[PDB]
Amino acid sequence: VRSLNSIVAVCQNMGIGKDGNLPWPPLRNEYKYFQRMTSTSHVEGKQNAVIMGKKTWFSIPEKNRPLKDRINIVLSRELKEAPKGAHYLSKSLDDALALLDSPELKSKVDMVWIVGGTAVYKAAMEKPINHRLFVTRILHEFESDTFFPEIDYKDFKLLTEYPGVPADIQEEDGIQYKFEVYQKSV
Ligand SMILES: NC(=O)c1ccc[n+]([C@@H]2O[C@H](COP(=O)([O-])OP(=O)(O)OC[C@H]3O[C@@H](n4cnc5c(N)ncnc54)[C@H](OP(=O)(O)O)[C@@H]3O)[C@@H](O)[C@H]2O)c1
Ligand SMILES: C[C@H](O)[C@H](O)C1=Nc2c(nc(N)[nH]c2=O)NC1
Ligand SMILES: [Ca+2]
Numbered sequence: 532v533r534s535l536n537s538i539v540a541v542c543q544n545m546g547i548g549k550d551g552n553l554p555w556p557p558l559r560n561e562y563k564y565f566q567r568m569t570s571t572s573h574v575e576g577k578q579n580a581v582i583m584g585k586k587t588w589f590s591i592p593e594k595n596r597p598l599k600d601r602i603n604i605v606l607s608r609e610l611k612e613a614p615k616g617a618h619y620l621s622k623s624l625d626d627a628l629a630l631l632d633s634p635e636l637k638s639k640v641d642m643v644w645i646v647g648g649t650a651v652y653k654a655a656m657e658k659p660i661n662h663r664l665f666v667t668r669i670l671h672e673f674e675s676d677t678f679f680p681e682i683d684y685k686d687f688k689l690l691t692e693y694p695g696v697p698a699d700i701q702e703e704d705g706i707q708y709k710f711e712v713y714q715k716s717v
Contacts, residue, residue, distance in 0.1 A: 532631055535655050537645035538568055539679055540667035551590055554673035560703050561667055562675055568665060571599050572641035577583020579642040582627045584651045588614055620710035624654045653680040664713040671706055
């Protein structure tokens with residue numbers, strides 16, 4: 532594919548999950564940002580694709596699956612068929628990537644977003660392809676059991692601004708966070 536996008540929200544310890552869910556209670560505005568970013572295509576007639584791991588898939592309440600308006604791909608080495616509601620099952624990112632470029636999809640897909648978890652982010656970060664990482668930094672610590680992998684600051688440069696991403700510190704429910712965009716160029 533031409534370029535990847537990854538989106539994640541992380542707390543001060545780099546935690547992204549806890550017991551199958553997020554480490555913090557619901558943040559409405561942060562979640563709508565994720566929805567807007569992943570859902571918005573810049574081409575009429577195309578939709579974005581979201582790739583995620585098996586635990587992330589199952590972390591979404593059943594009635595809310597598949598994430599509306601996007602093509603859902605789940606990654607799994609153990610499953611045989613796409614879980615009920617997902618559009619495609621792939622055995623590795625490479626395969627999800629090759630699927631995307633296939634004839635039937637290529638013409639249907641605008642952006643590719645990586646939505647986690649850990650091993651998915653890591654794999655995508657390592658591909659020698661152009662990539663933008665949209666990070667929400669939550670300026671607090673929450674107990675976590677799942678963490679975001681280390682980003683190579685020599686490769687991923689923090690942008691000082693980017694179209695449609697607020698620059699100031701945000702606050703909601705007594706919590707502060709900031710949006711950051713890192714860009715890797717090959
Ligand atoms: N804060 C956030 O932005 C954010 C984003 C996503 C998730 N989360 C949280 O993180 C947790 C889910 O994360 P996780 O890291 O534990 O799980 P995951 O990445 O969602 O799921 C792991 C399963 O995914 C499959 N898989 C993962 N990477 C693979 C690859 N490269 N190729 C093939 N299959 C691969 C494997 O399934 P098989 O074992 O079947 O092979 C692996 O066991 C939940 O707590 C969720 O709430 C938070
Ligand atoms: C897709 C499922 O919601 C998953 O937990 C994700 N959550 C978030 C995300 N990205 C942000 N910014 N916020 C979330 O809450 N990426 C993935
Ligand atoms: Ca497993």
